[PDB]
Design a protein around this ligand. Structure first.
Ligand SMILES: CCCCCCCC(=O)OC[C@H](COP(=O)(O)O[C@@H]1[C@H](O)[C@H](O)[C@@H](OP(=O)(O)O)[C@H](OP(=O)(O)O)[C@H]1O)OC(=O)CCCCCCC
Ligand SMILES: CCCCCCCC(=O)OC[C@H](COP(=O)(O)O[C@@H]1[C@H](O)[C@H](O)[C@@H](OP(=O)(O)O)[C@H](OP(=O)(O)O)[C@H]1O)OC(=O)CCCCCCC
Ligand SMILES: Nc1ncnc2c1ncn2[C@@H]1O[C@H](COP(=O)(O)OP(=O)(O)OP(=O)(O)O)[C@@H](O)[C@H]1O
Ligand SMILES: Nc1ncnc2c1ncn2[C@@H]1O[C@H](COP(=O)(O)OP(=O)(O)OP(=O)(O)O)[C@@H](O)[C@H]1O
Ligand SMILES: [Cl-]
Ligand SMILES: [Cl-]
Ligand SMILES: [Cl-]
Ligand SMILES: [Cl-]
Ligand SMILES: [Cl-]
Ligand SMILES: [Cl-]
Ligand SMILES: [Mg+2]
Ligand SMILES: [Mg+2]
Lengths: 704, 704
């Protein structure tokens, strides 16, 4: 089924073309170019990687600067009325401003760019696997994701800018490889080297890693994020261009931190999670700390699996509300923001007052819950992470904080709004961490702010099951490399306890959206099934001849939806594989022949250049062919990929899947091993759909 | 040619078996085991990864503790005679002790374990590529590498323990997967899961990464070292076991630093390069520092390429001296240690005395050259790296230090001794760094110890061309994550200038040794040559039948050196591929048949278990078959790999090499695309030798 979910939009799903056509007409290998053209490609490779890091760091500062200025002046308006002891007018100002900011973010998503809803990371993970996710990296998708995240984080919703920044950096990288938006591209001739799926995969890998770095000021952990979780294929040359892009981001981030520390960015200059200045120094290896630190890792895998189980149920319910229309998506976002505003305002009435933010109880008494609930989310993280504050938060007020963001983490992820998953899990993980550090009390020497850092890392390993990128991200946030063995100890337990119950949250969202992700290892029942038994449960192969009539090319373009056709002669010779995108091009160019001649090498080079062969902005329904041209002939030999990858009929599905994913294929031919004369030289085409364990188990149900 | 160099030993070279036989008789997939046996394999996977990190960290402390105790008391004996103003007796004590320590290290190498010479990193890089390097991970190779490194670093030679520790950790991992030495293995039944080349590749990857971590106390940079440089194949599950092993190493290293800081390890307790306690704090971005920092990167690529050019010439000369016999290897090591001792002692006589180590000039005057030359190498690094010492070393004495270790770096690498390449390059790189920082003088605010750190990183990127692992190694040495953009700036220039002249030093050593390393990308002339043209320049394929006579099996075992044979019938059916190691097993078991029957499924399971099918300690010359058994029959069907990877005759050599390296193959069948009856179903076998650009360019010379 070529139908899946992209963002919040049901769409048509194809695959990407990573395979190289080795004909010199196409010029797919950059090593076959001139010596001057290689230096142009190398210089533009490293200029694009610098501009990706420069623009991701510049946009992340502007999102950081606008959110705390909108939410900073919004709390002054609510603070203006609570000083006059008017709590009922301060509630409506707080709820009304949060409803208007959520309305701006959610109307831009549903009515202008529905793929800008969510974090966008499970669709970049699908795109770098080879799945052509449409409307993902446009210019209007990026602008809605930027403005819809400023309106959502400043509205006090339980979400972060951490997730959307990974998609913004991937959108910047895709727009720089084309020369701008899709109908406003500059036609600079040097940009023709990047009009292929092999180079767009390299660009979006640097762009998604710059967004992880812009979210956490972590230039090493951003490269380890894309290497471990997001990207499928990797080499050491891509590893060094990616690491260059993330170091430009921390140059831009640290240069604008020095400016916004000198008070010239306003009175709300000093930003959020990247402005984290608490290093936990001289952690003391006391032997009685084995019991609480192991319980941090055990509770992170238990709560991380329970959060994955309940979010999988909430997102199934939200898919029913989303299919009721576009006005039902807007009411779901405003209903969450209404419930969030009355719970972030009404719940500090139930807290206790500790003796000397003053809220609802007179002077000499400050509210420990209004410190966390009535602030921004990135400032509430730094209060729980704070060191040398041994009993700043009571045990009762931390249970209310933990129980609220357990509820707000479930209902905010999935609304038609640019959402995130890092900051809801950090807020939920730091709450039970400092609860377990306060409950130990005097029987431990680990700081209670360090228990909150270890708790936020454990809930993220229990939910997302990434571990080596999470270690370096939490080491570059705290700026303490001596915290590695105690951080890696709780990521070990939380991933182990978490993997024993269910899958990661990114495998669940990829399964809910129906995106055909190809996993690295085959199932053990795939080794007992062969490729030739898989071709008997599917219709026969639609092939073309080497010199083909125009009416046969038009017939396979109207009556089928396949994108590759084997090229035969009709003993008979298998020439290779021609794509659908090249069959439309010869019908649009009208490179037609009178007789059944096979042309020469100079005939195709007058009609086609390597630039127009790489373009994909063609459509078959605009091509009008009369019956005078339906009897002519097209020579398909200069446009056929004459070296496709093949398997034999007795090859297993397990080893064909390993070949399909290691090389990065879209189509895999099946040739006969029977070796007889008068045989068809191709008996199957395998695609991504045929080699998925979800689809094989429905046409062969007796294998599980 | 199956002849190459392994360490300092000419040896026979085969490849490793990574491909899975999907017959259930072999049990190669661990997912097809019982649920109890999977938990035994998972527990023993993570126990072995903990024991690799525990034993690599324990051995690295003992090498650190023994070297500075031997060299510490040796300098007290030389210091005893220079206080009596007897410099001629202090010279003979210094030269005599250094000659005796070099003699112990070099006799153990030439006469007991000749593969323990050098760093061992270019042979682990070859082993993880699929090349079966013999005598590399034995128990007596590890013990010679441990003792031969204590005797060599304490003898004042220009080499480090950094390189040999990568080979020691790989030897620990290989011995733990077998249960001890090769003739002293414990027969614990749970260790049968690790008797394959897929699991030895995972073990040695963690062991080589623990050795990089034990050398630099860098648990992140050790994982990035194996990922970028050493290992060929990588997945995210191996990435998390490797990162667990390196964090056990820094637990053991930091626990024995706290003990050897309290004076209980002796008066020479505080060790070397892992005892580096100079963080360079508040680096100030002054705009006049663009000119000296760019010159640090430009000189690192120029001197790094010139060092690669001259070491390639010195190692060619040393191969002529090594082939003159075993006593010529011992004299080359003693001649280098004689030249090193008289230059580390005689050269501080030429230096100037700066006013108040006192050497050769009276009180009120200390020698700035005796501080660097007459100490250990790891203590001379910390003096140049030292901060807030603005003019401790004169310009004249630093030219003598730089010019000496340019000479000593060339002649010490290659002697029959466990050598290294990190510490000669760090000493050479920190010398010109502090020369360029002293020459700027007052016109810069970057510390001159930070110029030495940036110079040592630039010469290592100009020579070894690794960049992302070198960044994190130098960030975890200095313990300063804010030094990333200025460190990555000079690694960018030095790798760029270095790559414009020649190759890295590990590609040169791999080429000098003749090891058949398979590179990731094919050459552009490989796309114009097909696989079927490659099979016409080689002898025809030696095949066997499915039920084969014993005399035919003995004939291909005596008259050929091939390790796989296609299994046919003789229209005719291609069954698959049988290995040479399984043909020796049925001749040793004498599973012989009277008639030409094909056996059943229960007949082979009485003769062979999955444990004895995985063992490789068999030899054909001990197998004695009389002429009464030469007319019998062997059923080769239950031992044949029935799903091998195949290509067609019209596939190019470029795309066959990509399939060969992505999957990890040893043999690749070539099937006909001609599709005729009465044809042989196999027309070629491709191996690692056939797909090498060095070998294709000699049988097809008109392609370059
Ligand atoms: C301060 C800014 C510093 C940035 C500049 C830093 C530029 C820099 O660091 O790269 C150096 C450049 C290599 O560029 P780059 O690493 O991107 O190119 C890779 C390199 O060519 C590998 O050798 C290839 O692998 P292989 O051999 O086929 O196996 C790999 O092919 P593939 O794996 O992708 O298929 C290539 O991608 O080499 C030069 O000397 C060009 C001098 C012109 C440089 C002009 C740069 C403007
Ligand atoms: C403090 C010490 C902490 C160390 C313990 C930390 C142990 C730990 O962290 O791993 C958890 C373990 C996974 O073990 P591990 O990651 O090594 O195994 C990989 C995992 O199974 C992947 O799912 C596989 O990929 P895929 O699915 O096929 O695609 C991969 O196969 P392959 O790619 O290799 O072919 C496997 O290698 O999962 C459990 O719940 C077992 C509970 C028993 C654990 C008992 C451990 C003693
Ligand atoms: N040329 C062809 N002739 C016959 N069947 C085909 C052909 N190409 C693909 N198929 C089969 O049709 C089914 C649907 O595939 P689809 O038409 O989506 O191919 P595709 O669009 O080329 O593949 P993808 O969607 O991965 O790009 C698949 O199971 C595939 O095996
Ligand atoms: N069964 C076979 N029949 C004929 N030729 C073969 C066979 N196997 C390998 N060859 C060819 O013989 C040449 C030498 O190969 P060699 O005998 O070293 O194979 P091998 O030992 O199996 O391979 P490797 O050394 O990579 O393990 C190679 O070019 C290869 O293509
Ligand atoms: Cl998403
Ligand atoms: Cl987020
Ligand atoms: Cl996410
Ligand atoms: Cl070596
Ligand atoms: Cl070394
Ligand atoms: Cl080395
Ligand atoms: Mg399709
Ligand atoms: Mg061989």
């Amino acid at each position: 089924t070529p139908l899946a979910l992209v963002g919040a939009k049901v769409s048509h799903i194809e695959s990407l073309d990573y395979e190289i056509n080795e004909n010199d007409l196409f010029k797919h290998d950059w090593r076959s170019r001139s010596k001057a053209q290689v230096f142009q490609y190398i210089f533009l490779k490293w200029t694009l990687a610098c501009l990706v890091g420069l623009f991701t760091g510049l946009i992340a500062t502007l999102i950081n600067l606008a959110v705390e200025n909108i939410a900073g002046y919004k709390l002054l308006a609510v603070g203006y009325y609570i000083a006059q002891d008017r709590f009922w007018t301060g509630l409506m100002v707080f709820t009304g401003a949060n409803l208007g900011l959520t309305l701006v973010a959610t109307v831009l998503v549903v009515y202008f760019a529905p793929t800008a809803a969510g974090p966008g990371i499970p669709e970049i993970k699908a795109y770098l696997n080879g799945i052509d996710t449409p409307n993902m990296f446009g210019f209007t998708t990026m602008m809605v994701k930027i403005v819809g995240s400023i309106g959502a984080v400043a509205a006090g919703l339980d979400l972060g800018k951490e997730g959307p920044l990974v998609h913004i950096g991937s959108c910047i990288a895709s727009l720089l490889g084309q020369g701008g938006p899709d109908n406003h591209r500059i036609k600079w001739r040097w940009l023709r080297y990047f009009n292929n799926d092999r180079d767009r995969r390299d660009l979006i890998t640097c762009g998604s890693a710059s967004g992880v770095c812009a979210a956490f000021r972590s230039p090493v952990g951003g490269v380890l994020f894309a290497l471990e979780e997001v990207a499928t294929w990797w080499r050491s040359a891509l590893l060094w261009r990616t690491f260059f892009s993330t170091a430009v981001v921390v140059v831009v981030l640290r240069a604008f931190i020095e400016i916004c520390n000198s008070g010239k960015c306003g009175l709300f200059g000093s930003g959020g999670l990247i402005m984290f200045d608490v290093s936990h120094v001289e952690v003391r290896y006391h032997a009685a700390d084995i019991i609480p630190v192991t319980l941090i890792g055990v509770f992170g895998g238990i709560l991380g699996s329970l959060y994955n189980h309940l979010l999988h149920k909430v997102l199934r319910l939200y898919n029913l509300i989303n299919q009721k229309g576009k006005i039902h998506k807007v009411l779901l976002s405003l209903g969450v923001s209404l419930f969030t505003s009355v719970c972030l305002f009404g719940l500090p009435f139930l807290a206790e007052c500790k003796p000397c933010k003053q809220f609802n109880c007179p002077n000499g008494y400050y509210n420990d819950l209004s410190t966390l609930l009535l602030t921004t989310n990135d400032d509430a993280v730094r209060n729980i992470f704070s060191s040398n504050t041994p009993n700043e938060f009571g045990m009762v007020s931390l249970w209310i904080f933990f129980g609220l963001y357990c509820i707000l983490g479930l209902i905010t992820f999935g609304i038609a709004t640019p959402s995130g998953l890092f900051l809801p899990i950090i807020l939920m993980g730091s709450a039970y961490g400092r609860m377990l550090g306060t409950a130990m009390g005097s029987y431990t020497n680990i700081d209670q702010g360090l228990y909150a850092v270890l708790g936020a890392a454990s809930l993220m390993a229990g939910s997302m099951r990434m571990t080596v990128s999470l270690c370096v991200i939490f080491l570059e946030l705290t700026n303490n490399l001596l915290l590695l063995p105690i951080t890696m100890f709780v990521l070990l337990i939380a991933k182990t306890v978490g993997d024993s119950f269910n899958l990661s949250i990114y495998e669940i969202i990829l399964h809910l959206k129906g995106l055909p992700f190809l996993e690295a290892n085959p199932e053990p029942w795939m080794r007992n099934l062969t490729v030739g038994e898989l071709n008997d449960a599917k219709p026969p192969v639609v092939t073309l001849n080497g010199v083909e009539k125009v009416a046969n090319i038009v017939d396979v373009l109207r009556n089928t939806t396949h994108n590759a056709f084997p090229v035969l002669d009709g003993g008979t010779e298998l020439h290779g594989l021609i794509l659908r995108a090249h069959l439309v091009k010869v019908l649009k160019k009208r490179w037609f022949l009178n007789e059944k001649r096979r042309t020469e090498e100079w005939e195709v080079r007058e009609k086609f250049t390597p630039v127009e062969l790489a373009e994909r902005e063609d459509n078959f329904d605009d091509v009008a062919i009369t019956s005078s041209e339906m009897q002519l002939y097209v020579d398909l030999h200069p446009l056929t990929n004459t070296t496709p990858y093949t398997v034999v009929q007795s090859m297993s599905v397990a080893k064909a899947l390993v070949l399909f994913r290691s090389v990065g294929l879209r189509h895999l031919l099946v040739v006969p091993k029977i070796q007889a004369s008068g045989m068809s030289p191709v008996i199957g085409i395998l695609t991504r759909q045929d080699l998925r364990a979800y689809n094989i188990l429905q046409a062969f149900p007796h294998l599980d």
